Amino acid sequence: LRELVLLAMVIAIKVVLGQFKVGDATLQVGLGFIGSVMLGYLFGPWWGFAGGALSDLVSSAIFGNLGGFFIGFTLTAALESMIYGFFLYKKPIQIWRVIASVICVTVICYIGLNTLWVSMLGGTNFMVALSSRILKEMITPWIHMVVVWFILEGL
Ligand SMILES: Nc1nc(=O)c2nc(CNc3ccc(C(=O)N[C@@H](CCC(=O)O)C(=O)O)cc3)cnc2[nH]1
Numbered sequence: 566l567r568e569l570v571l572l573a574m575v576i577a578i579k580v581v582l583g584q585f586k587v588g589d590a591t592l593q594v595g596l597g598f599i600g601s602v603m604l605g606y607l608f609g610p611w612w613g614f615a616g617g618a619l620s621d622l623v624s625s626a627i628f629g630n631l632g633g634f635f636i637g638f639t640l641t642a643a644l645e646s647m648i649y650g651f652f653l654y655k656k657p658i659q660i661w662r663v664i665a666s667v668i669c670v671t672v673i674c675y676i677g678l679n680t681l682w683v684s685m686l687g688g689t690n691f692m693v694a695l696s697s698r699i700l701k702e703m704i705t706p707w708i709h710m711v712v713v714w715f716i717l718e719g720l
Contacts, residue, residue, distance in 0.1 A: 572612065575603050576620040579646075583624050590632045591683050592698045594705065598670075601642065602713055605649030605666075606720065613654075617646030637682040645674045649713075658717040667709045676702050 579600025586595025600620070604613040621642040625634050652666035676695070684694035 568608075572608060572616055575600065575607065576616050576623065579604060579616070579620040580624040580627070583620070584628060591687065591694070592679075592701050594701060597642075598645070598709055599712060599716060601646040602649045602653070602716060603720070604646040605651075606653050606717060608650075609654045610647045610650030613650040614643045614647035618643035632686055635682060635686060637685070638679065641674050641678045641682070644678070645670055648673070653717065658714070660714070663710050663713050663717070667706050667713060671702055671706050671709070 579597065582600045583595060583597035586593045586597065588594055601617055604616045604620075608616060618639055621639045625639075630638070648670050649666050652662050652669070656662060676699070680691060680694045680698055683689075683698070684691045687694065
């Protein structure tokens with residue numbers, strides 16, 4: 566199939582942009598979301614969950630993660646690309662979908678899950694973790710939404 570040539574390239578994209586990030590073994594800030602949104606826009610949730618799940622393995626395998634591989638961050642990258650799917654897939658680019666999608670991702674994946682992982686990886690209690698990370702998760706969503714627009718428009 567043609568679209569599977571595509572899937573690879575966008576995994577490749579997702580992996581590459583993912584390497585533009587600043588941060589800690591606790592919160593990181595980067596362009597990885599850009600790729601993961603593409604996966605949900607173009608391929609839908611299932612293939613988007615697959616591609617996200619996948620692109621994390623690859624990115625891990627090549628670049629490696631601070632503090633080592635954790636199978637949790639994998640799940641996150643899969644849900645991340647799958648939620649942008651349920652929202653944005655085969656639909657007219659709208660602002661309310663962009664807000665809803667980035668808001669759900671940020672709550673479940675970033676605020677919920679990645680904190681759960683970080684809390685686990687470090688010795689912390691969850692809210693200790695949450696307190697270190699919550700400023701980012703309040704600020705970035707608007708940047709994510711704007712970027713998500715230009716991405717969705719551009720393609
Ligand atoms: N398999 C695997 N994949 C990974 O990416 C990974 N990353 C780490 C490094 N730990 C972290 C901790 C927090 C964030 C983080 O806070 N990311 C943002 C999303 C990225 C963004 O929004 O720019 C977040 O808010 O959770 C990333 C990596 C450790 N093990 C891993 N293991």
